[PDB]
Amino acid sequence: MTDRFTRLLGIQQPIIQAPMLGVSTPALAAAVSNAGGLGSIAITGSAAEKGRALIREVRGLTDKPFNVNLFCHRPGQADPARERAWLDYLKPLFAEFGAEPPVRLKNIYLSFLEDPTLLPMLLEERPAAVSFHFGAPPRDQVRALQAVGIRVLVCATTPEEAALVEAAGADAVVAQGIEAGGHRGVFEPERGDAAIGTLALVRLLAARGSLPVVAAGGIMDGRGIRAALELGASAVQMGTAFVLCPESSANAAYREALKGPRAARTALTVTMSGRSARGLPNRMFFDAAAPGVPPLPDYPFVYDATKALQTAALARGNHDFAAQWAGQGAALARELPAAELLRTLVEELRG
Amino acid sequence: TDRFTRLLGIQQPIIQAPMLGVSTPALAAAVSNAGGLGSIAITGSAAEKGRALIREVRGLTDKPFNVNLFCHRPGQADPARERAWLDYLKPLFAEFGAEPPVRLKNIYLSFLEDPTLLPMLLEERPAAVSFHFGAPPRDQVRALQAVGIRVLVCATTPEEAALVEAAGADAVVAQGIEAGGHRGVFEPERGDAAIGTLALVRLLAARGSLPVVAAGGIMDGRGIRAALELGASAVQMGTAFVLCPESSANAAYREALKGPRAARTALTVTMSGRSARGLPNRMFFDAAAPGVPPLPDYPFVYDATKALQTAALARGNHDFAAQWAGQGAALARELPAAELLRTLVEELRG
Ligand SMILES: Cc1cc2nc3c(=O)[nH]c(=O)nc-3n(C[C@H](O)[C@H](O)[C@H](O)COP(=O)(O)O)c2cc1C
Ligand SMILES: Cc1cc2nc3c(=O)[nH]c(=O)nc-3n(C[C@H](O)[C@H](O)[C@H](O)COP(=O)(O)O)c2cc1C
Structure with missing residues (x-):
């Protein structure tokens, strides 16, 4: 087995439990990190102070490295006419449930690129790893995180996006294949x-x-x-x-x-x-x-x-x-406490 | 595993894919002679011309090889749809001073619609016969197995791999999204x-x-x-x-x-x-x-x-x-096929 990644992150096992907004938790992350992998949480969609409280929750449950994930998409561009037409199109579906569509739509997930409070907060909390999805931050912001000992990961779906991750100075690239669940990491869809x-x-x-x-x-x-x-x-x-x-x-x-x-x-x-x-x-x-x-x-x-x-x-x-x-590969999914799934994967990796 | 190798009577668990217009009897023989399974594609040829190609392969190798046929739902002619298609293409043909064919032909008969292929294969008896786009009617996988032929069928999903199994094919070619050429989807x-x-x-x-x-x-x-x-x-x-x-x-x-x-x-x-x-x-x-x-x-x-x-x-x-x-195209290498085969085997052991 290569130690190129485990060395890097100071962990035992080359397994990361994916950040999954709405699915991962501090209990999940801590479980995996305590078993010897890299547990993860997603903090996009929260105020910086609330992300801070989530980082501290994980630290409360593990002393081991973990990963904090942020979306780095191009900041969404509001288009009230387009949004109104979309809402109008969805009307019959809302009406099935005795509801009406919202009156206005909101930018519910601020990108790292449009929320300047996020970088300072992370420079204070210093989780072991910070990961980015949908884009790479500027190289000077990646280097500011690394100057305080944080490892920086970025997801890429192609060699061309991997070149951009290299230009940003990341420590590792998360190569996300077509098989993956959840949002595709395509930078410019x-x-x-x-x-x-x-x-x-x-x-x-x-x-x-x-x-x-x-x-x-x-x-x-x-x-x-x-x-x-x-x-x-x-x-x-x-x-x-x-x-x-x-x-x-x-x-x-x-x-x-x-x-x-x-x-x-x-x-x-x-x-x-x-x-x-x-x-x-x-x-x-x-x-x-x-x-x-x-x-x-x-x-x-x-x-x-x-x-x-x-x-x-x-x-x-x-x-x-x-x-x-x-x-x-969803049909192979198993139900088990995360630390024991983690240990089962290790035994299978080495079996 | 030597599940597959023993089964096909070959040394190495590597099949060079049948590729209509790209594979040749010489390519198939080179791979078979180097220890893998060479392949040819015969769809689009009359049964006699298919027989001549199988005989060309046997002229160059006496090791096992694979003969591939398309098993698609037979094409259905729709003259008006075809005429509008050719109309849309017209300015392209015009750029090279030509114009479209007047009608369009079912240039590739599926195994399902050309009854001369099965008889032709039962006689010639290549080691493996493979099918793309669909699984032939079960009695025939049987008919080929009856006479010593291993039958392979490509699938792109677990559902289609079911349809291959029920057919009692001997092996399923699992074609991922990465694959070059035509996708093996049964029912697009x-x-x-x-x-x-x-x-x-x-x-x-x-x-x-x-x-x-x-x-x-x-x-x-x-x-x-x-x-x-x-x-x-x-x-x-x-x-x-x-x-x-x-x-x-x-x-x-x-x-x-x-x-x-x-x-x-x-x-x-x-x-x-x-x-x-x-x-x-x-x-x-x-x-x-x-x-x-x-x-x-x-x-x-x-x-x-x-x-x-x-x-x-x-x-x-x-x-x-x-x-x-x-x-994987960016990783392509230009080598004689037997030398490619030897390099792959070396890498598989290193
Ligand atoms: C339920 C779920 C939610 C996801 N949400 C995010 C996320 O918030 N941020 C992120 O970096 N990746 C997210 N991903 C993608 C994962 O990081 C990873 O690319 C993906 O899970 C790998 O494929 P697998 O699910 O087949 O393991 C999501 C994946 C799933 C399954
Ligand atoms: C040039 C080319 C032609 C193809 N033609 C056929 C064909 O005639 N018969 C068939 O069963 N598969 C055909 N395929 C698909 C292959 O059997 C196989 O699924 C594909 O080569 C696998 O991916 P790879 O090219 O990445 O190795 C062809 C693929 C290529 C690259």
Whole structure:
């Protein structure tokens, strides 16, 4: 086994439990870090002070390194006319549940690039690792984090995005293949999505690049981890494998969805949030290019609209609109305390 | 594992993929003589011409080889749809001073619609017969197995791997999204799950009955080792053999795959009517874009494209060529096929 990543992070095992906004928790992160991996939390969507309190919660439960994740998308551009047309299109769905769409949509997830309170807070709290999704911060901000001993990780979905992660000065690249659950890390989705599978992406980044590569997407057991290291990865990041952990904040309907037959087929959708994301298809996965569908508002305003519909639906016992993200290996998902899943993966990695 | 090797009577768990228009009897023999499983594709040829190709392979090797056929839902003619398609293409043909064919032909008969292929295979008896786009009716997998032939079927999903199993094929070729050339989806009007090799191979090895041949993105022995770790019994590699001098890739295609265009592949349905992965060019356009008419069936669309390729090529223009390649294309190497095979085996052990 290579120590290129474990050395870097000061951990025992080359396994990262994916940050998963709405699913990871301080209990989940601490569990994995205490078992010898790198546990993770996502803090986007919170005030800096509330992210601070979440970082301190994890520190309260583990003395080991953990990872704090922030979204670094292009800041969403409000478009009130486009947003009104979208809301009008969604009216019949709200009406099914005796609800009306919201009157206005909000930028619910501020990017690291538009919230200047986040960097100073992280320079104070100094978690072991800070990770970025959807883009890379400027090199001088990455270096400010490293000057205080924080390791910086950034997700890339292509070699061209991996070149940008290198130019930002990150410590490692998270190579997110098509198999991955949740939002695709594509930097500029208006330019398309190469939709490179994990087996090819990890090989290309390890064969033709020199930052340490963390493989992310479809990995559910030790055979998958061993395959990723054979491709040249220095570590793995696994999200869907940790969703059934009892430490996770997945709800009962999501656990049921993932343990059941729907796990056999995932799909990508832009209509849930405004950005391409993979999960178990439902009534929120519709064809945005069908006749009569108006133009999609920007991320994350579309997600604000969806969350109000999810609220209205859940207020009538209906879970057909929920965000139940999941990777293409979802049918191999197991339910176990995170620290024992972690140890099971290690035994399988070495078995 | 030697699940697969013993079964096929070969030394090495490496299949050089059948690639219509790229694989040749010389390529297949080189790989078979070096210890893997060489392959040829015979769809699109009369049964007698297929027989002549099998005999060409046997002229160069007496080791096991694989003979591939397309098992797609047979194409359905729709004259008005075809006429509007050819109309839309008209200005392209015009740029090279030609115009479209008047009608379009079912240039590639599925195994399902050409009753002469099965009799022809029962006599010639290659070691393996493989099918793409679908699983043949079960009695026939039986009929080939009856006479000593191993039957392989490509699938792109666990659901399609079921349909292969019930068919009692001997092995399933698990084709990930990384794969070059035409996607093996059975029923594309029904959608495309577009599953990556890493997930598909693990799913089929953990949940299915058959030896799994991993296909898509594998370019070196590390990729081979990875596939075996995921539970595959062997690999099938197409893009890695395209640069072999034994292939029938033309010079333009070789230069395209060696150059910077290998950094990015894409899927198109506008080249043939079915989703296929290669180096994008002027045949890779958005079929849903304003002004583009409904697409005709596979393989009729390919018939129109071949016509336009013939016309561009007469003017020395290669921008409409079919230059298929997988997502590992940037790792392509140019070696004699047997030397590639030896290098892969070395890497698989190192
Ligand atoms: C439920 C879920 C939520 C996700 N949310 C985020 C997140 O908040 N931030 C992030 O960096 N990645 C997120 N991801 C993606 C993961 O970081 C990682 O790319 C992905 O889980 C890997 O694929 P796998 O799920 O097949 O393991 C999400 C993934 C899932 C499954
Ligand atoms: C140039 C080329 C032509 C292809 N044509 C066919 C074909 O005729 N028959 C078939 O079963 N598969 C065909 N394929 C698909 C391969 O069998 C296989 O799934 C693919 O090569 C695997 O990915 P790789 O190219 O990344 O190795 C072809 C692929 C390539 C690259």
